[PDB]
């Protein structure tokens with residue numbers, strides 16, 4: 001019945017597929033679930049680790065319980081960007097300079113996959129753009145969007161590194177970063193914020209909201225249900241976001257002959 005085991009390696013965007021309560025139930029189907037609806041012979045294993053960088057994945061690579069499978073996807077980098085990890089250069093992927101850059105981490109991860117199954121298909125997924133993130137369970141956990149550099153690096157540099165590794169290895173890449181539907185303006189409808197001039201709440205869409213302070217101690221959660229668009233919190237995909245991701249991933253799986 002064309003059954004294929006698919007290990008999905010990732011961060012919270014992958015993790016949350018099977019923990020919808022952690023989205024505040026804003027999401028009903030994650031991208032693994034949706035991929036499987038499109039390609040029902042693909043049997044996912046969720047190796048998404050909540051909050052992890054590619055550095056964390058690579059650094060713990062022998063302790064994740066990774067198993068032999070027919071196809072692996074790797075969807076990492078957004079947390080590396082936020083944490084300011086150096087992207088590195090292709091040389092860090094080609095040679096063992098340690099788990100000290102994103103390129104280095106991908107070297108470790110792809111090498112492990114090939115150890116597990118030298119015959120397995122591999123797909124890389126670039127980070128999606130992200131707007132201002134506010135954690136639904138604790139608003140003190142927040143981050144600015146990818147319109148701004150973090151530690152001198154753009155999120156686009158991380159997407160470009162993934163694309164470069166894909167080209168070097170002749171491994172297909174799902175480019176979410178440059179996906180024409182996955183734009184900053186469509187991440188959230190508005191941020192619900194106090195107007196500094198009068199203390200009253202106002203719906204500020206993007207890019208207006210970049211100019212309005214958010215104080216999590218003096219402001220309700222700034223992304224009520226009405227704010228959901230491609231994400232429910234600035235960062236993590238909504239049902240709509242997950243559908244677009246799953247469709248893009250399904251196209252690549254088809255091209256690889258996995259359908």
Ligand SMILES: [Cl-]
Pocket residue numbers: 044045046
């Ligand atoms: Cl699972």
